[PDB]
Amino acid sequence: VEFVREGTQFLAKCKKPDLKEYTKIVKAVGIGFIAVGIIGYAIKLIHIPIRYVIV
Amino acid sequence: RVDPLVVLFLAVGFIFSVVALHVISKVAGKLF
Amino acid sequence: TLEYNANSKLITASDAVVALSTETNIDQINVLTTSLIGETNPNFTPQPNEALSKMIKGLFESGMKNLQQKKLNEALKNVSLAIEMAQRKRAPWEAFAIQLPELHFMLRSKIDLCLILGKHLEALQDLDFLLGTGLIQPDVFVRKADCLLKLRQWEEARATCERGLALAPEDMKLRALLIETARNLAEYNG
Amino acid sequence: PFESFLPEVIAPERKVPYNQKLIWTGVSLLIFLILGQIPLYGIVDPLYWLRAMLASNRGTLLELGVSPIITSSMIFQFLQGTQLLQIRPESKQDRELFQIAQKVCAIILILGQALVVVMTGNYGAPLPICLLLIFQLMFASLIVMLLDELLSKGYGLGSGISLFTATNIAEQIFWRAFAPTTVNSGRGKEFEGAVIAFFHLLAVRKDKKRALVEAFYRTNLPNMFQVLMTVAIFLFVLYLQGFRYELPIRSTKVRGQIGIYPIKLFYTSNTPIMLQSALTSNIFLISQILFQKYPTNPLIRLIGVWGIQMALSGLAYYIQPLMSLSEALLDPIKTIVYITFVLGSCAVFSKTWIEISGTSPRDIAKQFKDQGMVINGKRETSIYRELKKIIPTAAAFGGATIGALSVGSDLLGTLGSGASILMATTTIYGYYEAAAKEGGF
Amino acid sequence: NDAHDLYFQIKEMSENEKIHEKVLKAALLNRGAESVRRSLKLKELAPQINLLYKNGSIGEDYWKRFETEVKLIELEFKDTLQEAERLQPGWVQLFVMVCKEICFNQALSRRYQSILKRKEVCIKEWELKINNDGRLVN
Amino acid sequence: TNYEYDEASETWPSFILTGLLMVVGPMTLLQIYQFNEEVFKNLNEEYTSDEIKQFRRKFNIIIIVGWILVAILLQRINSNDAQSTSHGIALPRFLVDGSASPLLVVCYVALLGLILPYFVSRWWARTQSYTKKGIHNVTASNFVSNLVNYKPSEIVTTDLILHWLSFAHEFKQFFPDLQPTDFEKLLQDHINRRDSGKLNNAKFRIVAKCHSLLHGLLDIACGFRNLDIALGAINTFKCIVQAVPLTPNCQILQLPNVDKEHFITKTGDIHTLGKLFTLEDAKIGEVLGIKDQAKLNETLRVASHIPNLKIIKADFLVPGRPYISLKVLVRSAKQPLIPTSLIPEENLTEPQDSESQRDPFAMMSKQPLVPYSFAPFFPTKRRGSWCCLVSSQKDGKILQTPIIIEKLSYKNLNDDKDFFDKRIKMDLTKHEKFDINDWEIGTIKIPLGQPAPETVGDFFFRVIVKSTDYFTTDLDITMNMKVRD
């Protein structure tokens, strides 16, 4: 039960983000992840009919 | 020795070559 | 192009319009060959000449004697002639650390003479050359500030006074010059 | 050391700005991703785990993927860890020889693996087609290796392996969400994507009070509730990224430098989870192979028995992940032993990795003595004792939190594995924080 | 903007016009002086060009052009020394010092000659009114 | 596997519907979710020439269209009549098996073989040729090749810097037909307030582009640790901004409407703004020769607003890296001189907080921007600037790049405190409207950029702060660092 005690002590000693920082971080992460995923999805989609036609 | 545009041109040539080989092999059977 | 004279051994540019670098190099080659004509030894030495230095000192003394006679008009001409001779008829390959100090010492006396006589612009230009060629001491900044204020350049006057104070701040004349230039500038604005 | 004259991309002499780096990252990613859809020409042992972990798919030019590069790098990393190569930083020629040896062994490894797969694969034994097919794979692996070297030299935001893995994870998450494909099983054509089928049923069925309850649960195909769980866990793990410990530090060789040294919670998230996943995949592989080859034996039955395929009543049965709450309430001791195993595994893996990779508190203390930096409000002879009281506990708690998030995602049944999501988030947050500490658009 | 080809032109003209022999040595000393001056200039300009390059405000081609010029100047100087040796037997141990002095001396000579032209620029720029004797007449 | 396409319009309508909704919705929600006085921006447009106006003039529907197309598709869906698993795709049938079987594939082959590599190559060639400062590469090469073989004999004037500028390469792409001599002659015609005649649309463009080139020259000159050419650069930039030739009495010729043939001939003792304002109000009109009250008011109102600086307190600061601190008092050409003693000394001091200690320049980053300049002959509109450069005093070489400050408070110039005039000479500091807390004090900080010497003693420095759009009074002071350890 000492391990969770030290964990709680460490989290109380850490720094939790505020709103103005949390919103900026979430905006950046969301836009980056979406920009990667949408490209992946579109390139996986477009190549179905072409790979069908040429093959 | 090699610049980034060289690598990009190599990749584009490779891809276009494979696609052209597919389309020629397909049209060969369709025409004859 | 270029034409070669026979008897004068002087290379002259026969073209109509030539750049400045070509002219300077041609003049340098002319002076070099003119000195090599007189210098007879095949292995010439950087050792300075003697008779030329003696003539230079003789002309310098002849000019300085006019100050003892209080002849303030011909002494300047004599010193100018001595400087011209020491600059012209001295071979270029002579030692640097012996041709520089003589020129500096004579030019300082010439600056003092020209400033006392009443010519100013020539004094300012001589001071600027002497200060740019590698000699920075409070014996120059005072006279430069004096000439600048005399021919009415105030911002540069304060600038040079401050640079001068930035090397030997314990002087008693730089501070008076700073006060006077500050007053003149406050009048020039106000 | 030997003579080597082989192609390689050159690094820039000056630092490249943010935009010329971002555009190159994007275009390199687009090329690598198009290289993954086009099928081979010579076509006329399914390993789902290895092809999902190594960013590879069968039937395309990218069937090999980054596996030879990563295995060569791992081999040389292990050889350097065992102090056999005795690489010394006092010389640059040795480093050049090592980095060129990496490539000259990677190429022959690609050749060997490709020969193996063409000799054993399901393509067929029946020579010009064979040389064409081996040349195709050779050229594709060469191009992907050049792309890796380029993005690693500095023209790109980071390495290539992590970026490609995050790309595959995000692509799979979106494809499981907005899938346009349909299936017809008695009832009719139904969309395989959550939002697509949701809106389709909202539009054409016109019976809302039933359409909502039918589309929200969807016990057979992915639904919107799983999407809600995924976005919730995403926001949670993103909020969990800012947790860090900050101690004040100052310099002594040069005075007037006051600063703060951060100690985060997600120290080495990436390695332990993929290592443990590889081990579980290998164990499942070997257990299935032995159960197929041998009908029954004492040790064969004890290691694992497969049933309805899934393992049952065996050591491999315990290590398998839980599907839903039904299996959880069915056998509590199984859930207990599985949870303890998955937590202890990530804990010990984090510990051995922080001990091997050279990020030990003694190493940090020695590095501080090198830089001369000292704690702001503490003495010099106590810095190592202070790192001993912070680093191990932080690493252990981070590993435990990663394990807890993974088991929670697996029990909730999200669209993708929690390990994949956390890897994607931490690797993209690395890029974000690098751009922040550097400063750019 | 160089005095290298001038020596070759003088040599070619000597090949036909039968000019005196000391003019050749004069042109050679001129070429040597120019070479030593450019060598010193490059040696003293290297660090600041390097800083402007590492700052990222000059491009990439000029850096290599500079590095090439570094060795081109040395090659030219070596060829000039070889030509000097060919010109006179046992005349290399003194030529270096003679060149080292004439460079500085003619540098000072040019700086001093510039003042006659420099004097009227200030007149034109400040709109002074100076009569003879160099005094001010308001 | 092997899919089957929708040939009866059964699935792709909903596909396009959701694909449009998922991009429309964010747009709709984003749409529904959503100091420094300048008096020249109004007076400038009245005195500019008409041809310059002609030159300066010469050189959301997605939401609604998406909503309406979504409505059309929704109505089309509503109008339709609508154990092994059969895989199927949502794309229609004629996109893959109709008469357009080669169209799609050739379009994709084009988009992969032409548009991508060609565009990448063009963008690479466009962003690889430019230097970080914002100028071409050939221009920087020319500037450095001109500063390298530069004798100390030639005195830098305006003409030499113009002769360097007419060699720029960005002037060739604009007009590949002209020659450097034409560019030099054009710039001469601009500075002397002369008319080009036919090439006005070229002269205006080259003058408008001259700014970035002069900034590049200034930066490289400061790079070579050569001061005189930097000073010449700033002076020529003043000249080109104001459209006036550089002479002794220029501070009074920078005015809007003054006649040279009258001013130079009548008087020869008026050289600057203060000496000008010392005269009476009618005497100013009499000497300047415009004799028009409606026009004299404008020239007085523009001559009473160009800012002259003054030092109040400047000293070193020694953090891990030293940085100089300046305390200037921005004033106009009319306010009399106020002593330093009456300053309450409160605004001069700096509050010591952790945020201020971490980045002291944060406080300077707060002050407002500078207004629009008064450039009736510059083509565009320019903001004022202040270029500060530091120099040593032992040899006289610049030792860092010029830090170009931009933010400053010109509040002390406003027409509110017109009672504070110099022509009253009645000890106006003891007035009822005088508030020692009302006079604002700007602040400029220059990072020293070089490590402190390890020796112990006196070391002199010199900082210059020249204006870049007017011909006002500048700063030139010498401060010394007394390292003691």
PDB file of C-alpha atoms in Angstrom, chain F residues 53-261:
ATOM      1  CA  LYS F  53      -2.745  56.911 -55.933  1.00  0.00           C
ATOM      2  CA  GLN F  54      -3.457  55.207 -59.255  1.00  0.00           C
ATOM      3  CA  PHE F  55      -0.387  52.994 -58.851  1.00  0.00           C
ATOM      4  CA  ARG F  56      -1.075  52.031 -55.231  1.00  0.00           C
ATOM      5  CA  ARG F  57      -4.639  51.166 -56.252  1.00  0.00           C
ATOM      6  CA  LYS F  58      -3.589  49.206 -59.348  1.00  0.00           C
ATOM      7  CA  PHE F  59      -1.003  46.831 -57.875  1.00  0.00           C
ATOM      8  CA  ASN F  60     -18.388  31.715 -47.069  1.00  0.00           C
ATOM      9  CA  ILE F  61     -20.658  30.471 -49.857  1.00  0.00           C
ATOM     10  CA  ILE F  62     -19.342  26.951 -49.201  1.00  0.00           C
ATOM     11  CA  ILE F  63     -21.674  26.659 -46.202  1.00  0.00           C
ATOM     12  CA  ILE F  64     -24.843  27.515 -48.117  1.00  0.00           C
ATOM     13  CA  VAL F  65     -23.959  25.463 -51.199  1.00  0.00           C
ATOM     14  CA  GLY F  66     -23.220  22.477 -48.968  1.00  0.00           C
ATOM     15  CA  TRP F  67     -26.494  22.881 -47.093  1.00  0.00           C
ATOM     16  CA  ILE F  68     -28.546  23.148 -50.280  1.00  0.00           C
ATOM     17  CA  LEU F  69     -26.826  20.179 -51.937  1.00  0.00           C
ATOM     18  CA  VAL F  70     -27.412  18.175 -48.751  1.00  0.00           C
ATOM     19  CA  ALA F  71     -31.083  19.142 -49.018  1.00  0.00           C
ATOM     20  CA  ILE F  72     -31.217  17.988 -52.653  1.00  0.00           C
ATOM     21  CA  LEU F  73     -29.616  14.657 -51.768  1.00  0.00           C
ATOM     22  CA  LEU F  74     -31.964  14.194 -48.806  1.00  0.00           C
ATOM     23  CA  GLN F  75     -34.982  14.773 -51.044  1.00  0.00           C
ATOM     24  CA  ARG F  76     -33.559  12.361 -53.627  1.00  0.00           C
ATOM     25  CA  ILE F  77     -33.162   9.716 -50.913  1.00  0.00           C
ATOM     26  CA  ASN F  78     -36.708  10.333 -49.689  1.00  0.00           C
ATOM     27  CA  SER F  79     -38.023  10.016 -53.255  1.00  0.00           C
ATOM     28  CA  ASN F  80     -36.636   6.504 -53.765  1.00  0.00           C
ATOM     29  CA  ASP F  81     -38.830   3.464 -53.194  1.00  0.00           C
ATOM     30  CA  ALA F  82     -36.195   1.883 -50.939  1.00  0.00           C
ATOM     31  CA  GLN F  83     -27.527 -17.261 -45.499  1.00  0.00           C
ATOM     32  CA  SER F  84     -24.290 -15.943 -47.006  1.00  0.00           C
ATOM     33  CA  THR F  85     -22.928 -12.411 -46.840  1.00  0.00           C
ATOM     34  CA  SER F  86     -22.392 -10.457 -50.068  1.00  0.00           C
ATOM     35  CA  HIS F  87     -19.662  -7.832 -49.827  1.00  0.00           C
ATOM     36  CA  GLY F  88     -20.429  -4.580 -51.602  1.00  0.00           C
ATOM     37  CA  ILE F  89     -19.048  -1.087 -52.035  1.00  0.00           C
ATOM     38  CA  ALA F  90     -20.871   2.251 -52.113  1.00  0.00           C
ATOM     39  CA  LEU F  91     -19.393   3.726 -55.300  1.00  0.00           C
ATOM     40  CA  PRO F  92     -21.777   3.657 -58.285  1.00  0.00           C
ATOM     41  CA  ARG F  93     -21.394   1.321 -61.231  1.00  0.00           C
ATOM     42  CA  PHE F  94     -20.717   3.664 -64.153  1.00  0.00           C
ATOM     43  CA  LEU F  95     -17.647   5.049 -62.366  1.00  0.00           C
ATOM     44  CA  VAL F  96     -15.973   1.640 -62.758  1.00  0.00           C
ATOM     45  CA  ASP F  97     -17.645  -0.286 -65.616  1.00  0.00           C
ATOM     46  CA  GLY F  98     -19.368   2.291 -67.835  1.00  0.00           C
ATOM     47  CA  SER F  99     -17.889   4.192 -70.769  1.00  0.00           C
ATOM     48  CA  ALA F 100     -15.453   6.000 -68.423  1.00  0.00           C
ATOM     49  CA  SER F 101     -13.192   2.991 -67.866  1.00  0.00           C
ATOM     50  CA  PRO F 102     -10.032   4.722 -69.210  1.00  0.00           C
ATOM     51  CA  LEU F 103     -10.972   8.251 -68.090  1.00  0.00           C
ATOM     52  CA  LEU F 104     -10.469   7.760 -64.346  1.00  0.00           C
ATOM     53  CA  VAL F 105      -7.269   5.764 -64.734  1.00  0.00           C
ATOM     54  CA  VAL F 106      -5.699   8.251 -67.155  1.00  0.00           C
ATOM     55  CA  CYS F 107      -6.693  11.151 -64.898  1.00  0.00           C
ATOM     56  CA  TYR F 108      -5.039   9.453 -61.928  1.00  0.00           C
ATOM     57  CA  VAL F 109      -1.942   8.587 -63.967  1.00  0.00           C
ATOM     58  CA  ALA F 110      -1.735  12.259 -64.914  1.00  0.00           C
ATOM     59  CA  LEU F 111      -2.155  13.432 -61.317  1.00  0.00           C
ATOM     60  CA  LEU F 112       0.662  11.061 -60.327  1.00  0.00           C
ATOM     61  CA  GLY F 113       3.074  11.637 -63.212  1.00  0.00           C
ATOM     62  CA  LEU F 114       2.767  15.375 -63.870  1.00  0.00           C
ATOM     63  CA  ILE F 115       1.128  17.468 -61.158  1.00  0.00           C
ATOM     64  CA  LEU F 116       2.978  16.168 -58.087  1.00  0.00           C
ATOM     65  CA  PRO F 117       6.677  16.121 -59.105  1.00  0.00           C
ATOM     66  CA  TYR F 118       6.454  19.261 -61.249  1.00  0.00           C
ATOM     67  CA  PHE F 119       4.802  21.276 -58.483  1.00  0.00           C
ATOM     68  CA  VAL F 120       7.203  19.948 -55.848  1.00  0.00           C
ATOM     69  CA  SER F 121      10.131  20.902 -58.084  1.00  0.00           C
ATOM     70  CA  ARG F 122       8.795  24.416 -58.661  1.00  0.00           C
ATOM     71  CA  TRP F 123       8.162  24.995 -54.960  1.00  0.00           C
ATOM     72  CA  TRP F 124      11.624  23.660 -54.118  1.00  0.00           C
ATOM     73  CA  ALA F 125      13.253  25.962 -56.668  1.00  0.00           C
ATOM     74  CA  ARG F 126      11.264  28.919 -55.333  1.00  0.00           C
ATOM     75  CA  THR F 127      12.093  28.308 -51.667  1.00  0.00           C
ATOM     76  CA  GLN F 128      15.716  27.236 -52.151  1.00  0.00           C
ATOM     77  CA  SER F 129      16.891  30.393 -53.939  1.00  0.00           C
ATOM     78  CA  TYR F 130      15.913  32.896 -51.226  1.00  0.00           C
ATOM     79  CA  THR F 131      18.113  33.809 -48.273  1.00  0.00           C
ATOM     80  CA  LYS F 132      16.706  33.917 -44.758  1.00  0.00           C
ATOM     81  CA  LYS F 133      16.673  37.719 -44.696  1.00  0.00           C
ATOM     82  CA  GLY F 134      14.229  37.768 -47.612  1.00  0.00           C
ATOM     83  CA  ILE F 135      16.483  38.588 -50.562  1.00  0.00           C
ATOM     84  CA  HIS F 136      17.788  36.688 -53.573  1.00  0.00           C
ATOM     85  CA  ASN F 137      21.074  34.797 -53.507  1.00  0.00           C
ATOM     86  CA  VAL F 138      22.754  36.678 -56.359  1.00  0.00           C
ATOM     87  CA  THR F 139      22.065  39.972 -54.583  1.00  0.00           C
ATOM     88  CA  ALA F 140      23.725  38.799 -51.367  1.00  0.00           C
ATOM     89  CA  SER F 141      26.665  37.471 -53.367  1.00  0.00           C
ATOM     90  CA  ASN F 142      27.012  40.847 -55.099  1.00  0.00           C
ATOM     91  CA  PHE F 143      26.858  42.784 -51.821  1.00  0.00           C
ATOM     92  CA  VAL F 144      29.529  40.657 -50.182  1.00  0.00           C
ATOM     93  CA  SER F 145      31.724  40.754 -53.290  1.00  0.00           C
ATOM     94  CA  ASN F 146      31.416  44.546 -53.227  1.00  0.00           C
ATOM     95  CA  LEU F 147      32.279  44.896 -49.538  1.00  0.00           C
ATOM     96  CA  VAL F 148      35.255  42.515 -49.797  1.00  0.00           C
ATOM     97  CA  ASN F 149      37.307  44.532 -52.300  1.00  0.00           C
ATOM     98  CA  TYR F 150      36.401  47.938 -50.867  1.00  0.00           C
ATOM     99  CA  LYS F 151      39.321  50.293 -50.323  1.00  0.00           C
ATOM    100  CA  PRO F 152      39.251  52.434 -47.152  1.00  0.00           C
ATOM    101  CA  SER F 153      40.019  55.469 -49.314  1.00  0.00           C
ATOM    102  CA  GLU F 154      36.643  56.017 -50.992  1.00  0.00           C
ATOM    103  CA  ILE F 155      34.366  58.012 -48.693  1.00  0.00           C
ATOM    104  CA  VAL F 156      30.876  56.541 -48.538  1.00  0.00           C
ATOM    105  CA  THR F 157      28.260  58.916 -49.930  1.00  0.00           C
ATOM    106  CA  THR F 158      24.693  58.490 -51.140  1.00  0.00           C
ATOM    107  CA  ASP F 159      25.735  57.982 -54.764  1.00  0.00           C
ATOM    108  CA  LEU F 160      27.970  55.007 -53.960  1.00  0.00           C
ATOM    109  CA  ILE F 161      25.176  53.197 -52.134  1.00  0.00           C
ATOM    110  CA  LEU F 162      22.778  53.903 -54.993  1.00  0.00           C
ATOM    111  CA  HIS F 163      25.406  52.534 -57.379  1.00  0.00           C
ATOM    112  CA  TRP F 164      25.530  49.349 -55.318  1.00  0.00           C
ATOM    113  CA  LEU F 165      21.743  49.101 -55.191  1.00  0.00           C
ATOM    114  CA  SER F 166      21.220  49.386 -58.947  1.00  0.00           C
ATOM    115  CA  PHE F 167      23.140  46.087 -59.249  1.00  0.00           C
ATOM    116  CA  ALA F 168      20.485  44.015 -57.477  1.00  0.00           C
ATOM    117  CA  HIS F 169      19.129  40.923 -59.196  1.00  0.00           C
ATOM    118  CA  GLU F 170      15.492  41.288 -58.125  1.00  0.00           C
ATOM    119  CA  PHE F 171      15.322  44.312 -60.429  1.00  0.00           C
ATOM    120  CA  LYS F 172      16.006  42.093 -63.447  1.00  0.00           C
ATOM    121  CA  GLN F 173      13.046  39.715 -63.104  1.00  0.00           C
ATOM    122  CA  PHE F 174      10.765  42.749 -62.836  1.00  0.00           C
ATOM    123  CA  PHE F 175      11.970  44.256 -66.135  1.00  0.00           C
ATOM    124  CA  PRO F 176      14.316  41.973 -68.109  1.00  0.00           C
ATOM    125  CA  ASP F 177      14.556  44.684 -70.787  1.00  0.00           C
ATOM    126  CA  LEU F 178      16.266  47.411 -68.746  1.00  0.00           C
ATOM    127  CA  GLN F 179      19.893  47.831 -67.693  1.00  0.00           C
ATOM    128  CA  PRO F 180      21.609  48.811 -64.415  1.00  0.00           C
ATOM    129  CA  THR F 181      22.260  52.329 -65.714  1.00  0.00           C
ATOM    130  CA  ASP F 182      18.533  52.755 -66.308  1.00  0.00           C
ATOM    131  CA  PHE F 183      17.865  51.703 -62.715  1.00  0.00           C
ATOM    132  CA  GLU F 184      20.436  54.148 -61.338  1.00  0.00           C
ATOM    133  CA  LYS F 185      18.980  56.959 -63.440  1.00  0.00           C
ATOM    134  CA  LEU F 186      15.474  56.075 -62.237  1.00  0.00           C
ATOM    135  CA  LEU F 187      16.526  56.141 -58.589  1.00  0.00           C
ATOM    136  CA  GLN F 188      18.203  59.499 -59.185  1.00  0.00           C
ATOM    137  CA  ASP F 189      14.955  60.785 -60.690  1.00  0.00           C
ATOM    138  CA  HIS F 190      13.077  59.600 -57.607  1.00  0.00           C
ATOM    139  CA  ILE F 191      15.431  61.073 -55.011  1.00  0.00           C
ATOM    140  CA  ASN F 192      15.664  64.431 -56.773  1.00  0.00           C
ATOM    141  CA  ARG F 193      11.824  64.510 -56.932  1.00  0.00           C
ATOM    142  CA  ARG F 194      12.037  64.326 -60.722  1.00  0.00           C
ATOM    143  CA  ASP F 195       9.623  62.700 -63.160  1.00  0.00           C
ATOM    144  CA  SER F 196      10.447  59.532 -65.089  1.00  0.00           C
ATOM    145  CA  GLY F 197       8.123  60.433 -67.968  1.00  0.00           C
ATOM    146  CA  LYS F 198       7.261  56.981 -69.302  1.00  0.00           C
ATOM    147  CA  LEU F 199       8.734  54.434 -66.865  1.00  0.00           C
ATOM    148  CA  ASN F 200       6.748  55.589 -63.840  1.00  0.00           C
ATOM    149  CA  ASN F 201       5.271  52.144 -63.222  1.00  0.00           C
ATOM    150  CA  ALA F 202       8.842  50.810 -63.111  1.00  0.00           C
ATOM    151  CA  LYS F 203      10.339  53.543 -60.944  1.00  0.00           C
ATOM    152  CA  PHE F 204       7.555  53.162 -58.385  1.00  0.00           C
ATOM    153  CA  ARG F 205       8.049  49.392 -58.221  1.00  0.00           C
ATOM    154  CA  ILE F 206      11.821  49.544 -57.815  1.00  0.00           C
ATOM    155  CA  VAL F 207      11.498  52.260 -55.168  1.00  0.00           C
ATOM    156  CA  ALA F 208       8.918  50.159 -53.323  1.00  0.00           C
ATOM    157  CA  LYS F 209      11.249  47.154 -53.375  1.00  0.00           C
ATOM    158  CA  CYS F 210      14.310  49.215 -52.351  1.00  0.00           C
ATOM    159  CA  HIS F 211      13.419  48.798 -48.657  1.00  0.00           C
ATOM    160  CA  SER F 212      14.207  45.110 -48.181  1.00  0.00           C
ATOM    161  CA  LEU F 213      17.398  45.486 -50.216  1.00  0.00           C
ATOM    162  CA  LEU F 214      18.620  48.332 -48.025  1.00  0.00           C
ATOM    163  CA  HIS F 215      17.874  46.267 -44.926  1.00  0.00           C
ATOM    164  CA  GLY F 216      19.878  43.383 -46.360  1.00  0.00           C
ATOM    165  CA  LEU F 217      22.800  45.696 -47.087  1.00  0.00           C
ATOM    166  CA  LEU F 218      22.647  47.123 -43.565  1.00  0.00           C
ATOM    167  CA  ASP F 219      22.666  43.657 -42.016  1.00  0.00           C
ATOM    168  CA  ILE F 220      25.591  42.378 -44.087  1.00  0.00           C
ATOM    169  CA  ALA F 221      27.591  45.565 -43.504  1.00  0.00           C
ATOM    170  CA  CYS F 222      27.108  45.188 -39.759  1.00  0.00           C
ATOM    171  CA  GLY F 223      28.154  41.580 -40.283  1.00  0.00           C
ATOM    172  CA  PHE F 224      31.576  42.527 -41.652  1.00  0.00           C
ATOM    173  CA  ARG F 225      32.174  44.766 -38.602  1.00  0.00           C
ATOM    174  CA  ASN F 226      32.287  47.864 -40.806  1.00  0.00           C
ATOM    175  CA  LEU F 227      30.494  50.892 -39.390  1.00  0.00           C
ATOM    176  CA  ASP F 228      30.796  53.596 -42.038  1.00  0.00           C
ATOM    177  CA  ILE F 229      28.862  51.717 -44.717  1.00  0.00           C
ATOM    178  CA  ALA F 230      26.092  50.935 -42.230  1.00  0.00           C
ATOM    179  CA  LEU F 231      25.819  54.633 -41.386  1.00  0.00           C
ATOM    180  CA  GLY F 232      25.676  55.453 -45.081  1.00  0.00           C
ATOM    181  CA  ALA F 233      22.966  52.833 -45.536  1.00  0.00           C
ATOM    182  CA  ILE F 234      20.736  54.329 -42.846  1.00  0.00           C
ATOM    183  CA  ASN F 235      21.252  57.802 -44.315  1.00  0.00           C
ATOM    184  CA  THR F 236      20.381  56.718 -47.856  1.00  0.00           C
ATOM    185  CA  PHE F 237      17.296  54.966 -46.471  1.00  0.00           C
ATOM    186  CA  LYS F 238      16.176  58.193 -44.810  1.00  0.00           C
ATOM    187  CA  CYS F 239      16.738  59.933 -48.141  1.00  0.00           C
ATOM    188  CA  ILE F 240      14.699  57.455 -50.185  1.00  0.00           C
ATOM    189  CA  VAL F 241      11.853  57.391 -47.664  1.00  0.00           C
ATOM    190  CA  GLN F 242      11.507  61.162 -47.493  1.00  0.00           C
ATOM    191  CA  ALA F 243      12.379  61.996 -51.148  1.00  0.00           C
ATOM    192  CA  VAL F 244      15.016  64.644 -50.432  1.00  0.00           C
ATOM    193  CA  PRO F 245      18.743  64.908 -51.275  1.00  0.00           C
ATOM    194  CA  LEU F 246      21.091  64.690 -48.311  1.00  0.00           C
ATOM    195  CA  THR F 247      22.518  68.147 -47.521  1.00  0.00           C
ATOM    196  CA  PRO F 248      23.232  70.058 -44.265  1.00  0.00           C
ATOM    197  CA  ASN F 249      19.820  71.765 -44.044  1.00  0.00           C
ATOM    198  CA  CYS F 250      17.560  68.773 -44.657  1.00  0.00           C
ATOM    199  CA  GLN F 251      15.564  68.659 -41.412  1.00  0.00           C
ATOM    200  CA  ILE F 252      13.657  71.677 -42.750  1.00  0.00           C
ATOM    201  CA  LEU F 253      13.386  70.533 -46.385  1.00  0.00           C
ATOM    202  CA  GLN F 254      11.655  67.319 -45.298  1.00  0.00           C
ATOM    203  CA  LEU F 255       8.568  69.493 -44.712  1.00  0.00           C
ATOM    204  CA  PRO F 256       5.571  69.048 -47.047  1.00  0.00           C
ATOM    205  CA  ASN F 257       5.574  72.327 -49.035  1.00  0.00           C
ATOM    206  CA  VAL F 258       8.731  74.437 -48.921  1.00  0.00           C
ATOM    207  CA  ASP F 259      10.256  76.229 -51.904  1.00  0.00           C
ATOM    208  CA  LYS F 260      14.010  75.846 -52.314  1.00  0.00           C
ATOM    209  CA  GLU F 261      14.628  78.877 -54.546  1.00  0.00           C
TER     210      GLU F 261
END
